Amino acid sequence: STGSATTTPIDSLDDAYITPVQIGTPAQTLNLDFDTGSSDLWVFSSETTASEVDGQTIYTPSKSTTAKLLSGATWSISYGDGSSSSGDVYTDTVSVGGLTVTGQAVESAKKVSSSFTEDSTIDGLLGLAFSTLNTVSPTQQKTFFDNAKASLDSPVFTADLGYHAPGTYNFGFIDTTAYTGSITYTAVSTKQGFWEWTSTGYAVGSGTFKSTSIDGIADTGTTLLYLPATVVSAYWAQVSGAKSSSSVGGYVFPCSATLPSFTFGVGSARIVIPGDYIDFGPISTGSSSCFGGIQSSAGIGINIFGDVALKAAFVVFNGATTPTLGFASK
């Protein structure tokens, strides 16, 4: 089997991407944030505290003839941005782009933090990291990809995120029309539950490439590119007037600037992020200070190749017995 679904930016900045997902019988379609940095499929639901729902579409398990309470199971998750959610668990039929999993754990939110409530465009998350990170207790549950893997033509999914435009998540096949050149594959460590890999270095603009190992995670659920402070300082030093602002929470730059590109290494290959992809617009409406798309990871504990980086590439998440990641230009 295969599946193919379009993923769409939630706003004009590409702050996140939503992909329609069919849950239950008859289908209830929710728009979920596919997140290769986490491993829970959770949804706004008929059980979510009413004051914490503001415009989202909810899953109502009582209206699904295939929903079954997973008795005793609870879940609770906290994300790197400080947001969180928790609740109970149903199993139900879940389909993405024509690919169907029966008995998928659908984690029904009883509580969500304010940032979820305040984002009316995201009806939940669909985790695509390794199932060892799944938070369901006392019986850990498998991700959608893990449940589908055996049925797929090839044990892979691909992320093809657009810049200010829709893109595609494919399951079970590699669309050879979706990228240019060849795909360069690189080793993955699953020891932290992430799609964790080592970039071979970077360049700023037309500058010379610096060979240096940068361990980080391919995370479709993180908006920006978070890298060591040395790398980020070297980037922003090429932008007149750019500075790190503790009050804003990162590097800002004059909105009048033209930003240089940023290149990262994948083995001997190179992925170029155009300068425009690094512009996240005014810090507040009408400001001439703009927020940068490359930020320091110093406070996180891990480097994160988020959407800023991934949308410059066609990315293969290879879930073979030994997982690997592939990157191609497009």
Side-chain angles (χ1 to χ4, degrees), residues 1-62 64-67 69-109 112-141 143-148 150-190 192-242 244-330:
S1 63
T2 64
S4 181
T6 297
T7 192
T8 302
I10 64 167
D11 61 26
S12 63
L13 297 178
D14 299 347
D15 281 317
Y17 298 78
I18 48 172
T19 308
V21 177
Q22 282 70 51
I23 309 176
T25 311
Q28 302 179 37
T29 299
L30 275 63
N31 296 327
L32 304 188
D33 182 353
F34 281 23
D35 180 14
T36 62
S38 70
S39 305
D40 286 52
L41 193 177
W42 74 261
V43 296
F44 278 79
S45 72
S46 60
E47 302 178 328
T48 309
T49 300
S51 64
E52 294 177 352
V53 185
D54 185 7
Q56 295 80 11
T57 295
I58 62 168
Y59 168 58
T60 304
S62 66
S64 174
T65 60
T66 44
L69 178 73
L70 186 62
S71 180
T74 58
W75 62 280
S76 179
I77 192 160
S78 312
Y79 298 101
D81 65 356
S83 67
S84 63
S85 53
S86 60
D88 56 18
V89 188
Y90 294 83
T91 57
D92 210 339
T93 301
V94 171
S95 298
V96 176
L99 170 66
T100 301
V101 165
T102 59
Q104 173 67 43
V106 178
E107 299 170 37
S108 169
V112 303
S113 66
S114 56
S115 65
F116 289 115
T117 299
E118 291 163 1
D119 182 5
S120 66
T121 72
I122 289 175
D123 303 323
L125 267 66
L126 190 149
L128 292 168
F130 293 88
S131 293
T132 53
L133 291 179
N134 176 267
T135 78
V136 176
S137 179
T139 308
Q140 186 172 63
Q141 301 294 304
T143 69
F144 175 83
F145 178 54
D146 218 330
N147 282 323
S151 303
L152 294 178
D153 293 354
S154 181
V156 305
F157 68 92
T158 65
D160 181 9
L161 302 179
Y163 167 67
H164 295 351
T168 305
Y169 281 102
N170 290 329
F171 292 83
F173 73 106
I174 287 162
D175 179 357
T176 61
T177 73
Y179 59 88
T180 62
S182 55
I183 306 178
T184 296
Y185 290 86
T186 197
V188 164
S189 172
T190 67
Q192 296 191 82
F194 299 122
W195 292 91
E196 187 174 358
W197 65 290
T198 303
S199 173
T200 50
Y202 69 98
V204 177
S206 55
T208 59
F209 186 85
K210 174 74 168 178
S211 291
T212 182
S213 293
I214 303 172
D215 180 287
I217 65 164
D219 184 1
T220 59
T222 291
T223 310
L224 307 185
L225 174 53
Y226 294 90
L227 292 174
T230 50
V231 178
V232 176
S233 183
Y235 178 81
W236 288 108
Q238 296 305 310
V239 179
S240 288
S244 183
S245 166
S246 55
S247 62
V248 175
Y251 280 90
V252 297
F253 68 94
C255 293
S256 58
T258 299
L259 297 176
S261 64
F262 184 88
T263 300
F264 64 94
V266 183
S268 54
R270 306 288 180 254
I271 300 295
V272 180
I273 306 172
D276 288 354
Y277 291 25
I278 299 159
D279 183 358
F280 279 75
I283 61 172
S284 297
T285 304
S287 179
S288 73
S289 290
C290 273
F291 197 70
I294 295 179
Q295 297 293 344
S296 179
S297 65
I300 298 174
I302 198 156
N303 300 308
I304 307 173
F305 293 87
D307 299 333
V308 163
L310 302 181
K311 72 192 180 182
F314 177 87
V315 188
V316 180
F317 294 80
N318 170 28
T321 302
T322 297
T324 65
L325 280 163
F327 294 80
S329 295
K330 64 186 185 190

